[PDB]
Design a protein around this ligand. Structure first.
Ligand SMILES: CSC[C@H]1O[C@@H](n2cnc3c(N)ncnc32)[C@H](O)[C@@H]1O
Ligand SMILES: CSC[C@H]1O[C@@H](n2cnc3c(N)ncnc32)[C@H](O)[C@@H]1O
Ligand SMILES: CSC[C@H]1O[C@@H](n2cnc3c(N)ncnc32)[C@H](O)[C@@H]1O
Ligand code: PRO
Ligand code: PRO
Ligand code: PRO
Ligand code: NA
Ligand code: NA
Ligand code: NA
Lengths: 129, 129, 129
């Protein structure tokens, strides 16, 4: 076998997406898998990724209610040697669309470069209050 | 949606907790979820976190017996902008209490700052020998 | 309990192994657990590790077919204080043998030092074309 060392700036990302809508279990990990593939194909990027099922705990920002839910951690290692701005923008857009598609209050996105965190973002719904 | 960049020093942690007591499967991931919420509430900290079910392999330190068990990886991203000492102390205390509550020989705690590991600790029972 | 800080250079690794052979679901996480234990014992190293079940998406390199499969993320924290070359070589050998044993096109290996990525490798089959 060939031991090929990966090219580029060493970008990776983690995205956390919950599967409850408020206190109601609603979605599944496979829904997130399929939606992520579809979004990434429309970006023209290789969709390759890992999806980890989790239990998650989140405090709702408006009401303060604590929710325990199923959630998904998406792990993306860049295998295409994208620029920092290109990778970051595509991951941000993916997180923003996942938030809408799963009707979520918040999606967390972490961007790394050689494992060093460049940015942690909370993508937060602007539902009118 | 708002793309809010997270504040503070960028602290996060990972805690590994097994669910066997010796060679006996005993606990579940939901037990760890509930106990973690309870401990973190008593610390006055937001309990928000992710919990990953795993299979784990561990060599018992006294007997050398190899155990294969279910285990839990707790992933904590600090969203409250705590100081390094405050975050580290609260995570250490959480790990120490989880070790007791689940009757474990060892719990592993990793503390990161912007993804860079600051400390890896093995929290080890002092059972008399 | 004792809060023991871990010794050595702070090495860790992640290995991603799929469980499909082409488009056919074939293997299970427990198969990977058992095979990893066996390989690491023959290396003379402590086998201790974590194994995370995942859904994975991979683009086959020859045909371009997109596969969705079950997969495993192996997480290894070095608890024995190995040298960089010793740890790296043993993890590389483990990944290469897992690729063969599970008839895989590609296995991904990431090596970290204090969380900073030193190398990401794709271990790729050299099947004749
Ligand atoms: C943002 S809410 C969606 C999911 O993100 C994860 N999550 C939320 N807050 C945190 C946090 N501070 N640390 C780790 N994971 C979190 C949990 O898995 C949750 O189900
Ligand atoms: C400390 S024993 C509890 C759990 O920690 C994890 N674990 C133990 N040792 C290691 C190691 N060296 N690397 C990664 N995970 C480990 C395994 O999931 C185990 O079930
Ligand atoms: C290498 S194919 C084996 C497994 O590796 C993981 N994988 C493949 N490519 C990527 C990638 N670019 N980022 C993250 N995980 C990936 C997926 O879980 C897959 O099932
Ligand atoms: O967005 C929601 O409504 C729930 C709570 C956190 C993520 N899932
Ligand atoms: O502590 C115990 O007894 C088992 C072995 C490792 C963690 N769970
Ligand atoms: O190697 C294979 O055939 C499948 C596709 C990626 C990993 N598992
Ligand atoms: Na890939
Ligand atoms: Na949160
Ligand atoms: Na161990």
């Amino acid at each position: 076998s060939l031991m090929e060392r990966l090219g580029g700036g060493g970008f990776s990302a983690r995205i956390f997406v919950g599967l409850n809508v408020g206190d109601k279990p609603t979605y599944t990990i496979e829904d997130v898998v399929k939606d992520t593939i579809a979004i990434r194909k429309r970006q023209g990027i290789l969709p390759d990724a890992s999806f980890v099922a989790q239990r998650g705990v989140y405090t709702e920002q408006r009401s303060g209610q604590l929710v325990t839910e199923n959630s998904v951690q998406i792990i993306i290692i860049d295998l295409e040697g994208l620029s920092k701005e290109d990778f970051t923008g595509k991951v941000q857009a993916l997180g923003k669309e996942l938030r809408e598609d799963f009707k979520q209050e918040s999606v967390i996105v972490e961007i790394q470069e050689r494992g060093i965190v460049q940015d942690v973002y909370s993508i937060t719904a602007e539902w009118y209050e």
